Amino acid sequence: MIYSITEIEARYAETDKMGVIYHGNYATWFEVARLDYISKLGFSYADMEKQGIISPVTDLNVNYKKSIFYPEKVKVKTWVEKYSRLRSVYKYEIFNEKGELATTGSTELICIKEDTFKPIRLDRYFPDWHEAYSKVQALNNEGKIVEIM
Amino acid sequence: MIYSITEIEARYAETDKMGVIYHGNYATWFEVARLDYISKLGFSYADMEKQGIISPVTDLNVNYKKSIFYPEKVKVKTWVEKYSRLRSVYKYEIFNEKGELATTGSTELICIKEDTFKPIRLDRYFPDWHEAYSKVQALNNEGKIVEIM
Amino acid sequence: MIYSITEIEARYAETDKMGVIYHGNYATWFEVARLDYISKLGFSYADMEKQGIISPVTDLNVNYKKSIFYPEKVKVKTWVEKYSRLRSVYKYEIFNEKGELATTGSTELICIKEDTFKPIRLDRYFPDWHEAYSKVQALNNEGKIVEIMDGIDSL
Amino acid sequence: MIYSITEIEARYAETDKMGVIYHGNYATWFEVARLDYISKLGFSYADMEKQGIISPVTDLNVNYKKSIFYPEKVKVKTWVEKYSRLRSVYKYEIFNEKGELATTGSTELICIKEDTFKPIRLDRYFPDWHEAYSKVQALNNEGKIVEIMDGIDSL
């Protein structure tokens, strides 16, 4: 797949009494990595929001293989496992500061009008985004491995 | 003073690695208590937002006398130390599950227009809120001590 | 199934700039619900931690059917879908103030030693929790439907 | 004074319903910036915790001069306004992407034993930290203006 790599430094505030990063904070890290993937493809989510279209998460999955600690510097690998004009599924891997796989997960996102909350086809409102995502989907299907920067 | 009392149950998620409630979370508890005070005076902040006026915090102060632990049930005492048509200063005391004073603090709030962020006089926009806050201020100045409910 | 209902009132701090409850905050609400389930069944997670045992989440799933717009009072339905002495899977449903199904999800939990993070068996460290979970599991397999709550010995 | 500059990029998760950074999240930004100051001075707070000493906040002030609308890259300026072997007071300034002063604030910290939460004197446990903070206090009193950073022995 076409993937991005995002570096995140764990915060003390993100710890819990167990002494590890609280499991509920991982969605925030996925969101930082997903917005970094979007940036690196050449797009701005902040831009899309400026146009009255929002992109909610419809499904979150996190699988915690190893705990993460403060003050680890981690890397998040992000890619789009499935793209269609109605929904996208992002997948993630988090590597700990020793380079080991600590976490896997996924998020499904759709796009909806902000007034209505009604879903929308991305090719009708953002054909530039659609073209890029469709291109990437075809590269992923062919087995291309590339880091976008 | 005229005061409210708000019960809050500490969450596991609100802990940090030290094994106490993280200091940054206290603003959230002051907000819960302040919105409870407003509700018990007979108003709804959500109502105010529906009219296009929002009320940002301009100053936060927290003095931590004792740590608080999961799963303590605490009580927050809230009052308006100072009311004017341009700002309000709320004060707080947090009592831990043994009834000891754990925390004091304060928040200053103003009211601004949502679209421009420009400050407003409460009396011009919400005369009924103004009348209530004014009436409380005068009871406070007389040294009246009562729990609102 | 044997289930609990927990009421949660959304907080302003839990909103994002869409005016909805931020999707990352739902894990906290599942925690509140799950700890309420355990209490209603007769047990205290803080008492487990006093013995030097912690119970972390090892898998999280949340499926968002409807946005939750603040303000809102919600009800969280919790039950144990699968119990074994090494891991439990809790499932959840969140209803909004109108009674509509807003969210579903699940959490897998293990128990470990606080010091080494080594996994332990619930029956060896907490035989009373094991007996209760094992009884629930059998009732759930028989299709019993019961709301547990304080003050009623409903099992 | 002797100060650090920490860059923070705001997260969508940090926003509330007004579309601004929620006022309760600023403490976490002061934490990031304080830990950056500590690291740039040559120390690791993780290492302090390995030795069984923790350093909690005992007083928090935040004065919000301008809202911080998401997205934003901000710069946090941190310094130690007062050091003694029993407590430290850090001060902060946050500048927005336009260079404007958005926020000021302070945090008072002590050091305590992790097991008993009893307070300690920094000089009895960490003579290196005490010597560095005492030097910096002297330089701050004389009016020196220096940005500390990695790779430059600015003191």
UniProtKB/TrEMBL annotation, chains C, D:
The keyword Cytoplasm does not apply. Pfam families: 4HBT. Keywords: Hydrolase. Gene3D superfamilies: Hotdog Thioesterase. It comes from the Bacteria. Residues 18-102 form the Thioesterase domain. SUPFAM superfamilies: Thioesterase/thiol ester dehydrase-isomerase. One of its GO terms (molecular function) is fatty acyl-CoA hydrolase activity. Belongs to the 4-hydroxybenzoyl-CoA thioesterase family. This is 4-hydroxybenzoyl-CoA thioesterase. It comes from Staphylococcus aureus.
